[PDB]
Design an enzyme around this catalytic site. Structure first.
Site, short mmCIF file in Angstrom:
data_model
loop_
_atom_site.label_atom_id
_atom_site.label_comp_id
_atom_site.label_asym_id
_atom_site.label_seq_id
_atom_site.Cartn_x
_atom_site.Cartn_y
_atom_site.Cartn_z
N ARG A 264 0.81 -1.19 0.00
CA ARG A 264 0.00 0.00 0.00
C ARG A 264 0.85 1.25 0.00
O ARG A 264 0.35 2.35 -0.32
CB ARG A 264 -0.87 0.01 1.27
N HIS B 231 -12.00 -4.00 -4.44
CA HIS B 231 -11.59 -3.38 -3.15
C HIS B 231 -12.83 -3.09 -2.28
O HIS B 231 -13.36 -1.99 -2.24
CB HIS B 231 -10.80 -2.09 -3.44
N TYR C 299 -21.45 14.07 -7.45
CA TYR C 299 -21.45 15.44 -7.99
C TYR C 299 -20.21 15.72 -8.84
O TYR C 299 -20.02 16.84 -9.31
CB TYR C 299 -21.40 16.45 -6.85
#
Lengths: 463, 464
Positions: free
Chosen positions: B3, B49, B93
């Site tokens: 990660r 994920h 949005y």
């Protein structure tokens, strides 16, 4: 809107969207469960584009047999409990539709319900589900919690179906006659949690007026000890009463000085005996007296404030039982007429194509020679239209036929399929012309659903 | 750890790779309308994920920001935040699709050019690495300048990197010393999306020679003065990853706390029209160049890029020099081209085999049609075709699957022509597999076309 169920399918938008996402994803009863994350993601991407808890919370609640009288989701993994055990996260649980949820979605791809564009206009979503059993009444909506805008109790599928069949058959009956017939058949709520309803008036009020106070109670058994000590054993609780908060409340009432008859509390519940809360009472106490104090000071007795509030053609209405049943029946007749209309249009399109294929088979040597003699596909297409007196769409279907379709058995299959589709068209036309056949279809299809998925009453009623 | 450190071949970590792959597989390409960001988030979450955290949308947003990535991989529409503290709008949005350069990261991923493995629930396959047809790790860099970041590889100018890659392709067998000299000759230093300045050469050379170096960055400041002697400093560029709002706050704090005694006011006059414009008025008795120097000492107007070139190589974290970053990238491109050519050759052979069966049927077409029509069932026609034409099951099935439209004259000849064409294609693919220097030439030419179309000017100026 987010607060009130639609009268026709008993759903609010987040639940409807979750069930449609699952259905469209192929998460059916006859296939392995899918990770819950998949159903949450499909719903979030297409219908509810918020990363809020309501999607997975809805999926979970629809999977809990203490929450829904007829679960719509079949969960695998930790979906919580009737107490305070939290459900596992969505990547640790799996879910698919139940067989009854398949009946909510049945033939939704046959133009049986209105669809509208979703939030970004890229896909369509259903405004309502076919709901081939009376889900609003079967599973109810809202709850006993303060702030619930509606509170429709769940009911027994077999009783509801008797009332639906009555209203179907007695299509000319007025409201007074219909209300009496459906109230004769629907005895009262039937909660997933069983227990007791005590008294008749609250139920009658709810069905006649849309509001009533329905007294619920759990079930207590009495046990003897060897040392002569008697215990009360709670084996059932009223609908929506949290098992852990209930156990806690007894302890707390005891301290606060209520419930003076109680010497000991122990939760003996398990996977095999179900709920079993064991309350030892003092040698001086009377079992019957202690039980009544439990009714008073705990949720062992609690009222279900029925408020039969649902959306009808876009407007909230407080409805009587005859109206809930009749609006549901109107929906089923709409779904059947729409489905038959769709099937008829598709059957006519299919027949049109098969007629062209049969003409080609009747002139097969000539058709094949014409195609091979044609320099290009457009010239062959034109040539087929002239040779067979067919139109563009028929000619294209001939040109799209694979050579495998010319084996004798496959030629016969085309001929047989045309005869079969013309008989289907005749039958569909007849269903559209005959309201009696339409009523008969709702009746027969619901009867099959109830024969397979109906179950016994759980809540006992005491007048 | 996976990660925290990029893979050396494509410069990505798992969440960013999964977002891009999800977007590609969903068809959210540059040549189609932007899709709501919620869709890319949802596709990634459901398939790759499955956590409800914001890591996916955070990934998508960061890849769309032109102040964050030297070569953005996501093309966003809407509020994707700013180089200051303004939060991006919610995923319902904003809208997003891949950029043309991201399309080059995923190019020909469907041609068995990278290893795929089963995803988290075993239902679908996901890529272990992307084709990365430009050197994304070096172009976009990884990690960052803050204390405690696991890695800090700077972004670089694509044209300069391509010059280094071209040298490595041509000089495939050069040893590490010669390769390092040649690539450091061509890659002048980092090129940050935020422009600015790099001061001196030592830190850059150290970074490239050893994997660690302290590269001094500076913003750009102009003195504006008038005839009354009023003087202001105007900051129009800042170092890479220096947050505009936290920078402005830091000046106000250093002033309040007794450094920067020469400052009378600070005002943010940045706009869409003028870009960054932070205006610092200095006191009548202060000297502008003295205040500039104190801003370099006491704020991030000058700040170090602590390069730490740590990446995963064959699953092992390694601190790498610039020649190793380039050579591991080149090895991955040669692997992609050999794999692509192997796939194309297998598919072409499969297609030639079917076409040979179809040509046999066309040569005997009267007999074929008569045999099929005389066959009671499809199974019986299939057996009869095998016997008639001396073909196998898959060829006989392709004949049974031919549509009547293919029997028009031009379509019969199209099948025969296609066999001749596919045989020529097979010879050409065999020649590529036989010639390592042809394969290097293919990478060179394909990368050149990418750099020609997508390369741009250096932004960060390197000074003495």
């Amino acid at each position: 809107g987010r607060a009130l169920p639609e009268v026709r399918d008993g759903l609010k938008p987040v639940h409807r969207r979750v069930l449609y996402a699952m259905f469209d994803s192929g998460f059916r009863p006859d296939r392995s469960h899918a990770k819950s994350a998949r159903s949450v993601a499909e719903t979030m991407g297409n219908y509810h584009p918020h990363g809020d808890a309501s999607i997975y919370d809805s999926l979970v609640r629809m999977a809990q047999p203490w929450s829904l009288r007829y679960p719509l989701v079949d969960g695998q993994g930790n979906f919580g409990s009737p107490g305070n055990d939290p459900p596992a996260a969505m990547r640790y649980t799996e879910a698919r539709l139940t067989p009854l949820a398949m009946e909510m979605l049945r033939e939704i791809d046959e133009e049986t319900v209105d669809f509208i564009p979703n939030y970004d206009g890229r896909v369509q979503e259903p405004t309502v589900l076919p709901s081939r059993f009376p889900n609003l009444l079967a599973n109810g909506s809202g709850g006993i919690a303060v702030g619930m805008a509606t509170n429709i109790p769940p009911h027994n599928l077999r009783e509801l179906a008797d009332a639906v069949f009555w209203a179907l058959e007695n299509h000319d009956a007025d409201e007074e006659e219909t209300l009496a017939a459906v109230m004769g058949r629907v005895k009262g709520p039937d909660f997933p949690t069983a227990g007791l309803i005590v008294g008749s008036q609250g139920t009658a009020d709810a069905y006649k007026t849309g509001r009533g106070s329905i007294r619920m109670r759990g079930v207590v058994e009495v046990e003897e000890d060897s040392r002569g000590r008697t215990s009360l054993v709670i084996t059932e609780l009223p609908y929506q009463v949290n098992h852990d908060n209930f156990i806690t409340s007894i302890a707390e009432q005891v301290r606060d000085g209520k419930l003076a008859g109680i010497s000991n509390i122990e939760d003996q519940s398990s996977d095999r005996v179900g709920l079993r809360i064991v309350i030892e009472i003092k040698r001086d106490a009377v079992a019957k007296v202690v039980i009544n104090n439990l009714y008073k000071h705990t949720q062992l007795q609690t009222s279900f404030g029925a408020n039969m509030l649902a959306i009808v053609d876009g407007v909230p209405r407080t409805l009587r039982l005859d109206q809930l049943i009749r609006y549901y029946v109107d929906h089923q007749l709409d779904v059947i007429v729409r489905r038959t209309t769709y099937r008829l249009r598709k059957a006519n399109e299919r027949a049109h194509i098969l007629r062209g294929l049969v003409k080609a088979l009747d002139a097969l040597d000539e058709v094949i020679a014409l195609i091979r003699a044609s320099e290009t596909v457009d010239i062959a297409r034109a040539g087929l239209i002239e040779l067979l007196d067919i139109d563009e769409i028929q000619a294209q279907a001939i040109l799209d036929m694979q050579l495998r379709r010319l084996a004798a058995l496959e030629r016969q299959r085309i001929i047989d399929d045309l005869a079969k589709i013309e008989a289907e068209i005749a039958d569909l036309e007849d269903i559209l012309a005959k309201p009696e056949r339409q009523r008969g279809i709702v009746r027969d299809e619901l009867a099959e659903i109830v024969d397979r998925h109906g179950d016994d009453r759980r809540t006992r009623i005491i007048a």
